[PDB]
Amino acid sequence: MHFETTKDGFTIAIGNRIILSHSPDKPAFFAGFGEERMDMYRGNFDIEDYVIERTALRHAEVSGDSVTLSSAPGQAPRLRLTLDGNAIRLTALDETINRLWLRVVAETDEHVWGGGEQMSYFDMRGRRFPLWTSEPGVGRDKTTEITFKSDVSGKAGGDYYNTNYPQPTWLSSRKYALHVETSAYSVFDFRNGDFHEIEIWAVPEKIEFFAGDSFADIVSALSLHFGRQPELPDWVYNGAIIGLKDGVNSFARLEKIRAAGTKVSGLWCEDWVGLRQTSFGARLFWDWQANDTRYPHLRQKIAELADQGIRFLGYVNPYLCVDGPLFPVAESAGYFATDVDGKTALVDFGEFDCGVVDFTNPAAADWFAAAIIGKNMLDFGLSGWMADFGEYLPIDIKLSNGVDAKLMHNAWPTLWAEVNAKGVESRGKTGEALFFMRAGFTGVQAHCPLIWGGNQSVDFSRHDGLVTVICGALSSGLMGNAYHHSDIGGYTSLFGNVRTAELIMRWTEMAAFTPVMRTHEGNRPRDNLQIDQDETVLAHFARMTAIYVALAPYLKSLSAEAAKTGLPVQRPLFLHYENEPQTYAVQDCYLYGADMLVAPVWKAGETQRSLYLPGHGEWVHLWSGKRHAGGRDITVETPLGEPAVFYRADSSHHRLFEQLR
């Protein structure tokens, strides 16, 4: 990167792209001090800053191979800037600073994407995005009654910016990416036309830059920096992972699903550990071993299923309930985070308390990986699991490494991902065992093989329904997570919001053109329609699983590309159609690899779908074989069973796509 003096200050560029511009009248950096409030209630945070100082660093001077910045001439410098390859390193010279703002040069028509897994807005331009892992919210839109009710009853509605997986990384339409190396609270402010502003509640070690001739090349570079995932295991291609939580009755319902012709790769029973009924619904018993009361012959059932070519998956998270038998084992070994007095810190998860396994203590992390992931899960015969949570570290607890919980909070999902990966690696099953996370932060990419979109409401809402999954996939894919999926039919049923047949079927239609089809009974299984309970829904589901299986050779080539190049399986239109600027904000269609275009129906009652077909070639409608020229809007019929999916006539996979007609 290139530092250049000007009349009154300096610029820093990557290539011909100016990134920072400083003068006394238009400073690049501001420094100061704040006292935050961050109140936690069941993984929801009410965050408010009290800024005591925000002071422009107007005065720059060269000092060896660095620049120092002070408030004004004749004042002691507060910040040092040092160029180091593709990074700007920052050193706090005034050790009182706990707030830093940095302005980066922006253009009027510029788009910015990333920010981790964003659930509402893909193109972040025009809005402000705090980056703090938490519950994403139920409803996530202060104008909906679901959100309002969630806020009033449990401070749980959230808003457009909340996510289980924030990351302080952006990709700019100017063909560079920026990454802030920090775990502190930070904010991306894209409200101004002429600059982007980053707020950090720390002076980060460095800010790193990635450039390239194409967006694809920059995503490759990012994925190499954060780490790539293994290829999907071959067993996944046998069909859907059926999610049931009905104890021994799960087996009979699976047989019913199978009798309809459904292609099944796995049975996922999150209640393998037992249930705990709460006011929220049928939650799980958070003690990570097979529960003989709920599944008295589970090991035998796993072997029966294996003989039928079906794997078995469970559930785990990084907390232990106080009333479970593992809790005193962990407490006795000193493996829990502590409170200010050195006692085990108890966290309320909603009508039950848990200890937090302290992964900053290497012995605790090793115990979790060896005893739970290794012995209780993999050695018990699980091929995979939901690896849940990560987003709830309160900021008033004490960690074994002595690092403030305010800094460890965002790091937690990555530490948790690493515990899972180490367990898997200790059994030689990297690339074969499949665990999936909803929570993330910088670095989760290297350890987690598959993301899921967390809890959507069981609806077609704009800010917590079906369509938000696509936003999540697109954003997280640019950040180097190649594989994304969602709960078919959503999760959260509260305040009378329950599934419909149509919702399930539309969600299944999308899921068949993603890496993994997986169902979930949700928080209130008997209040919500499940895939086995309606003949039409089940037959539609079976058919969609057959389509997914017929498409597996294509999906498998996309997984190979993901390993070779880092490119996500679900890509935004602009990644392959860079010279069509009007595509740059599209977030409800994706390219499934380079050769298929998918435009999910995300509203009730729709019989048709309108969308933009890009490029100058031909697109072939998957169900009819009708060809259409690229470069225009079209409207196609989308009855249930026939989502709006097209393939490139030029595709090397055309013979396969022709089969689906």
Distance from C-alpha of 241 to C-alpha of 199, rounded to nearest angstrom: 41
End-to-end CA gap in the chain: 51
Give the nearest distance from C-beta 495 to Cl ion in angstroms: 5
**Does residue number 589 form part of the binding site for ligand NSQ (CB under 6 A)?**
no
x/- site string to ligand NSQ, residues 517 to 556, per CB under 6 A?
A: ---x--x---------------------------------
Number of residues that bind Cl ion (CB under 5 A): 2
Residues 463-492 that bind ligand NSQ (CB under 6 A): 491
Tell me the window of 280-288, 354-362, 375-383, 610-618 that interacts with ligand NSQ (CB under 6 A): 280-288
| Nearer Cβ to ligand NSQ (359/385) | 385
Neighbour-count burial of 336, counting CB atoms closer than 10 A to its CB (0-12 exposed, 13-18 middle, 19+ buried): buried
Distance from C-alpha of 565 to C-alpha of 488, rounded to nearest angstrom: 29
| Contact (Cβ atoms closer than 8 angstroms) between residue 231 and residue 563 | yes
Distance from C-alpha of 62 to C-alpha of 74, rounded to nearest angstrom: 15
Tell me the window of 12-20, 92-100, 215-223, 277-285 that interacts with ligand NSQ (CB under 6 A): 277-285
From Cl ion, ligand NSQ, none, which one binds at residue 460 (CB under 5 to 8 Å depending on kind)?
none
x/- site string to ligand NSQ, residues 34 to 73, per CB under 6 A?
A: --------xx------------------------------
Select from 187, 207, 488, 494 the one that contacts Cl ion (CB under 5 A).
494
**Does residue number 283 form part of the binding site for ligand NSQ (CB under 6 A)?**
yes
| Contact (Cβ atoms closer than 8 angstroms) between residue 157 and residue 482 | no
**Does residue number 284 form part of the binding site for ligand NSQ (CB under 6 A)?**
yes
| Contact (Cβ atoms closer than 8 angstroms) between residue 249 and residue 202 | no
| Nearer Cβ to ligand NSQ (487/532) | 487
Side-by-side strand order, sheet with 206-211: 59-62, 67-70, 79-84, 87-92, 206-211, 176-181, 166-172, 112-116
SS3 471: helix
- The pair of three-digit structure tokens given for residue 610, joined into one six-digit string: 């309108």
CB atoms within 10 A of CB 190: 22
Give the nearest distance from C-beta 153 to Cl ion in angstroms: 8
Select from 223, 455, 456, 493 the one that contacts ligand NSQ (CB under 6 A).
455
| Nearer Cβ to ligand NSQ (436/584) | 436
3-state helix, strand, coil in the chain (%, to 5): 25, 30, 45
Select from 350, 615, 631, 641 the one that contacts ligand NSQ (CB under 6 A).
350
| Nearer Cβ to ligand NSQ (190/491) | 491
From ligand NSQ, Cl ion, none, which one binds at residue 175 (CB under 5 to 8 Å depending on kind)?
none
**Does residue number 451 form part of the binding site for Cl ion (CB under 5 A)?**
no
Give the nearest distance from C-beta 154 to Cl ion in angstroms: 10
Computed on alpha carbons and rounded to an integer, the radius of gyration of the chain in Å comes to 25
Q: How many helices (H) and strands (E) does the chain have?
A: 12, 37
**Does residue number 246 form part of the binding site for ligand NSQ (CB under 6 A)?**
no
**Does residue number 454 form part of the binding site for ligand NSQ (CB under 6 A)?**
yes
DSSP string, 357-396: B-TTSHHHHHHIIIIIIIIIIITTT-SEEEE-------TT
Distance from C-alpha of 413 to C-alpha of 390, rounded to nearest angstrom: 5
From Cl ion, ligand NSQ, none, which one binds at residue 427 (CB under 5 to 8 Å depending on kind)?
none
Nearest CA to 354 out of 258, 288, 413 is that of 288
| Nearer Cβ to Cl ion (494/503) | 494
The set of residues, in sequence order, having a beta carbon less than 8 Å from that of 154 and lying 6+ positions away, is: 41, 42, 44, 350
From Cl ion, ligand NSQ, none, which one binds at residue 280 (CB under 5 to 8 Å depending on kind)?
ligand NSQ
From ligand NSQ, Cl ion, none, which one binds at residue 227 (CB under 5 to 8 Å depending on kind)?
none
Tell me the window of 128-136, 233-241, 491-499, 604-612 that interacts with Cl ion (CB under 5 A): 491-499
Give the nearest distance from C-beta 16 to ligand NSQ in angstroms: 45
Residues 502-521 that bind ligand NSQ (CB under 6 A): 520
SS3 188: strand
CB atoms within 10 A of CB 500: 16
From Cl ion, ligand NSQ, none, which one binds at residue 163 (CB under 5 to 8 Å depending on kind)?
none
Helix (H) / strand (E) containing 413: helix 405-426
**Does residue number 111 form part of the binding site for ligand NSQ (CB under 6 A)?**
no
**Does residue number 388 form part of the binding site for ligand NSQ (CB under 6 A)?**
yes
Give the nearest distance from C-beta 523 to ligand NSQ in angstroms: 6
DSSP letter at 419? H
- Cα separation values, 193 from 111, 163, 586, Å: 11, 25, 20
Give the nearest distance from C-beta 43 to ligand NSQ in angstroms: 5
- The pair of three-digit structure tokens given for residue 94, joined into one six-digit string: 């005034």
| Nearer Cβ to Cl ion (118/523) | 523
From ligand NSQ, Cl ion, none, which one binds at residue 388 (CB under 5 to 8 Å depending on kind)?
ligand NSQ
| Nearer Cβ to Cl ion (495/623) | 495
Give the nearest distance from C-beta 494 to Cl ion in angstroms: 4
Residue with the closest Cβ to Cl ion? 494
Select from 117, 208, 231, 270 the one that contacts ligand NSQ (CB under 6 A).
270
Distance from C-alpha of 570 to C-alpha of 597, rounded to nearest angstrom: 10
Give the nearest distance from C-beta 409 to ligand NSQ in angstroms: 17
| Nearer Cβ to ligand NSQ (281/381) | 281
Residue 571 pairs in a beta bridge with 591
Number of residues that bind ligand NSQ (CB under 6 A): 14
CA neighbours closer than 13 Å in the CB half-sphere of residue 159: 12
From Cl ion, ligand NSQ, none, which one binds at residue 228 (CB under 5 to 8 Å depending on kind)?
none
From ligand NSQ, Cl ion, none, which one binds at residue 155 (CB under 5 to 8 Å depending on kind)?
none
**Does residue number 495 form part of the binding site for ligand NSQ (CB under 6 A)?**
no
Residues 627-646 that bind ligand NSQ (CB under 6 A): none
Classify each residue of 533-560 as buried b or exposed e, where b means 16 or more C-beta atoms within 10 Å of its C-beta.
eeeebbebbbbbbbbbbebbebbeebbe
DSSP string, 591-645: EETTTEEEE---STT-SEEEEEEPSSSEEEETTT--EEESSEEEEEE--TT--EE
Distance from C-alpha of 661 to C-alpha of 649, rounded to nearest angstrom: 14
From Cl ion, ligand NSQ, none, which one binds at residue 494 (CB under 5 to 8 Å depending on kind)?
Cl ion
| Nearer Cβ to Cl ion (136/281) | 281
Distance from C-alpha of 626 to C-alpha of 618, rounded to nearest angstrom: 10
Neighbour-count burial of 582, counting CB atoms closer than 10 A to its CB (0-12 exposed, 13-18 middle, 19+ buried): exposed
From ligand NSQ, Cl ion, none, which one binds at residue 42 (CB under 5 to 8 Å depending on kind)?
ligand NSQ
Tell me the window of 495-503, 520-528, 596-604, 628-636 that interacts with Cl ion (CB under 5 A): 495-503
Residues forming the site for ligand NSQ (CB under 6 A):
42-43, 270, 280, 283-284, 350, 388, 438, 454-455, 491, 520, 523
Binding footprint of Cl ion on the chain (CB under 5 A): 494-495
